[PDB]
Ligand binder design. Structure first.
Ligand SMILES: *[C]C(*)(*)(=[N+][C](*)C1=C([O])C([C])=N[C]=C1[C]OP([O])([O])=O)C(*)(*)(*)(*)(=O*)[O-]*
Ligand code: PLP
Ligand code: PLP
Ligand code: PLP
Lengths: 331, 328, 329, 338
């Protein structure tokens, strides 16, 4: 296949480093070698993260089409909108964000710290629903004579949204080369879908598509899984996957998404603390903390073949921790 | 001089990238080329930052010394203490932090968001109020503590990190094929600008390191940078003396107090964030961003100068000043 | 029966006033006449409320025993502990409070505003968590004599006298008004507030007219505590009847979803009551009982022409720990 | 003097009680007897307070004019706007509140707790502008008033603190009168009154009410504005206009208006270390709470005056607790450990 056919606008530092999680792994019995690829450290634009990798392939079309405003949407503590706001500012574009109440969480500063605080500082017009927002948004832009580039939730349901992470697999291969070995697995957090989509496609190439263990954080596994499966197939087409994406290539564990999207369970919190305390690597209570929780449990349940080398994709999400201050008041 | 003599423990991804601040540069007139060396993006340990570069030179001694607990100190929203906590966990060491009330700011979640929040999740013993007090606590507790002063600054190895930064800059200016005429850096505890002074004294550009005070006590800050630069110049074998002309510290933007932004600070933070997508904070970086922007605007920089802004980190503290930014 | 047998230490301004809720009644159809008894405005000690009426009958004993420290317990935004902290202060006594997290809520300032904020200012030693026993032991051990006040003052020999007095007060005021109330709406969680009332009104045959509104979300249990406390209390004031389960009325339709958490109906009732009468209620206690009464009048559960007396127990300060919910109203 | 000439709509339970501050009086040496008249406990309408006493003489006019909306104004933790909001809801009137941060303070939950939170729950249209918007400059006051008209309603304008209004000082003339009535019930007299002062019609009403019996200079005002000159002038002006309004047949002299300035620091709405100790001291002896903006400053004053022997030995000092407690919620960090 050839991803190179599509331009890629530089929004990151370059390939993302892979680090070993020796302590955590040892702490879990050293039967599985845990690593982490730091998408959460990929950019100077308000901490970047997975979405910013996706955005590298969307911005050319946006620029190509002469759009002057980037418009997107997500929950109050959405990492996506924050990155869009930063990318927009860096690209000299306006930005309109529609933030809705996607989480049944009521915290005094939920709408004033973390991701959303940055978006406002970055100059985005941050529109908070009551309590069609999307179309009003696009229109107000047109109305103001601007031209909006619509970026759907997480950049996922878009023709280009699966690309970024195809190249992710492509990166892991280059690093594996210098590494003298290939990872047996890839643990990734899944919600809107195009991150795991790209990976499924990217690793399908060398037949590891089913080695990408997605961990659902949506709490709506069915939809999420179907969106990954769907987004993959389409992306595979878009790149030239000399193979087809089977409903067996899309893996999605559903044991760690509870209780609801945006709410952590006690395993989520323990996982965040375990990992932060052994590696000095933080994960959040909405996304990464759930995928981390997933891996620690998989490992702990011997679900991973001794000697296995698992690559944990850390997608970002850390700033959202500020929206859950009470839970971590004593750590 | 010879920095290589001293061991360095990898806590960073490696050399920090330099980026053009084209939009901001153009916005201010096009007469001065501004760039940013991202020390704030140097590590996977809870955002890292400048303090993390410093730490790489102190850790070896902690390890050598067989120490098992890193002890440090700073205000409630201290970046230093958060980095020590992350480094600590990464090394598998204990961590005791003395968070003092160094800022006359009253915010309902000041001691529960941002930096301090991370230090607790990172498993550090976070004590709120003492230095010696905690240290002894550790010994009396049966553990060997490695003492890390505020900002890692007043310490024998505290200046090495940024001596290394000037070296990195050199190595990058070579690749870039051009040299920066100045460096704008925020200064509070001192060993950051101290290391740069010694580093750039090496090639005759000490006085091009333009520090901006964020302490609101320029006198002490300037003297600390000088003292640190001399002790550090001696350790690296600098074949020269640090003169007062080598320590440039602008006092115009620290106001009104440490930990407290002025309207210029916020204006600066909004401008830079909105032109480059690059965030700075109300305590440190915003104040240095503010000075650099104001310098350009005053024409204090020679038309054509290339200014390397050093972004030391600190963004997480923004969570403690949420009401100020509630509408942007 | 005889209530005067027990000494009452004054901690209130005197009987609590009764106000008509003319606007709310009309808003709901004017078929039922709603009134309110401001237990929430009963004291100058940190806003007071129902717990303070209870405490008047417990303090003489703490003093008699020469106790020097009041010890109590409750959730983070407990009203009980805040009132106890204010009484100790007033009395000149120490105060140790065991604050437990009884609510699945995690707001950023939950342990720093509202009731708990007041307790710390009032000089109480606020310990965030055997919990209860350790506290007591610790006082003795420190050289003090602690008076034990169980949650809500409820499971305590004297916990029920305060509201036996409430019914006493009500008949007197009913006289003054030349008429009587047909029903009393009241919020129940630990039990002695409703139990006291059940006893005082049994005395005139209106026990079963004290409509309890569960806010525990564990109705069976709460209902059992009201029943028990009530029987132990009716005995202590020499009620001429043994208290029957049929004397205790506890509606459990408005308690959801959990203790300390409001439902969309709770929010609606707080808003409507606030916007028609200028009287605030909280998302943990009163708003639930308010929701209850409004719902009853609405479903036409009170006979046409009834006079309902809503007992406003207090609680308003807890509103501060639920600031996100009310950000826009 | 004939205050009875002006109608008074009930918004209170009746005369506010007076209580002895025996514990605090004892702690300071026993040489001075402190009491508190509880205006802070005067109403069932969202905790009420002094502003509510003032409102009783304004509402009759609002009603006679057929107004359907009460429009007022104040800072973020304003006590006045919260009382207006409750009074409005109670009367079946709409309410528009014009608000802005009038304090150089910026706590994370400042605009979502305490007073302003209640106003919103009470159904007021709380129009809070962003920093630097400057309402008093753009005259947002008037726009709100006009927008009510534009919307076809009829607004009743209530100025900051009810003070600079023709009827704004009547309520506290009633306070002097009521005090006289209680001094007769009690069988004894109060030698001074301590009252926090900012917009001024509270103390102005007192000055007029007490001048009628030669006790005006007995009302010791304690500035919490940190702008004593203006505040003194507004009190004096309000006093004179009200004096005339109630037929007081005497002039209010410069000597009748007493405003201490020593306890206002460092700025309106910002407490000083003495403010905080006073709050803690009073609360820990009497179980009576006071706030960082208003009452805590006047409480600080009284305590300090007593401590400095500024009160003749044996005086009975009546502390007027004007309210304000809900505002403690906006200063949570300061009290995080008590
Ligand atoms: C959807 C979304 N966030 C995407 C995301 C993250 O920001 C982090 C830190 N982890 C995982 C995800 C899930 O990625 P996908 O592509 O499946 O949505 C947002 O902010 O709206
Ligand atoms: C500590 C710090 C500074 C000041 O550095 P010093 O070495 O103490 O002079 C500036 N910016 C940030 C983000 C810091 O953490
Ligand atoms: C404690 C409390 C209740 C419940 O009273 P119980 O006697 O425990 O049943 C109701 N409302 C408020 C405001 C309370 O503080
Ligand atoms: C408004 C107010 C004051 C000052 O009264 P003025 O009439 O404005 O001088 C004092 N205390 C409290 C609690 C207030 O709300």
């Amino acid at each position: 296949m050839n991803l190179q056919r599509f331009p890629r606008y530089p929004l990151t530092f370059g390939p993302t480093p892979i680090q070993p999680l020796a302590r955590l792994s040892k702490h879990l019995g050293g039967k599985v070698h845990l690593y982490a690829k730091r998408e959460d450290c990929n950019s100077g634009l308000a901490f970047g993260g997975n979405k910013t990798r996706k955005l590298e392939y969307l911005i050319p079309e946006a620029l190509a089409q002469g759009c002057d405003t980037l418009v997107s949407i997500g929950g109050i503590q959405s990492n996506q909108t924050r990155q869009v706001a930063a990318v927009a500012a860096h690209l000299g574009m306006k930005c309109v964000l529609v933030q809705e109440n996607w989480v049944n969480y009521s915290d005094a500063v939920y709408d004033r710290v973390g991701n959303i605080q940055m978006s406002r500082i970055l100059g985005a017009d941050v529109r908070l629903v009551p309590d069609r927002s999307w179309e009003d948004a696009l229109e107000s832009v047109r109305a103001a004579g601007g031209k909006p580039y619509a970026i759907p939730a997480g950049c996922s349901d878009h023709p280009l949204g699966g690309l970024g992470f195809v190249g992710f697999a492509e990166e892991v291969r280059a690093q594996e080369a210098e590494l003298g070995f290939k990872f047996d697995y890839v643990v990734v957090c899944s919600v809107t879908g195009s991150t795991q989509a790209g990976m499924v496609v990217g690793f399908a190439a060398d037949g590891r598509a089913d080695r990408v263990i997605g961990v659902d954080a949506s709490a709506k596994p069915a939809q999420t899984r179907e969106q990954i499966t769907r987004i993959a197939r389409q992306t595979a087409e878009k790149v030239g996957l000399e193979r087809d994406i089977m409903r067996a290539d899309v893996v999605l564990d559903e044991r760690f998404a509870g209780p609801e999207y945006g709410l952590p369970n006690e395993g989520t919190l323990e996982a965040i603390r375990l990992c932060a305390r052994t590696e000095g690597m933080l994960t959040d209570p909405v996304y990464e903390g759930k995928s981390m929780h997933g891996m620690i449990e998989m490992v702990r349940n011997g679900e991973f073949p001794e000697g296995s080398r698992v690559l944990y994709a850390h997608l970002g999400g850390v700033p959202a921790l500020n929206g859950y201050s009470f839970i971590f008041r004593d750590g």
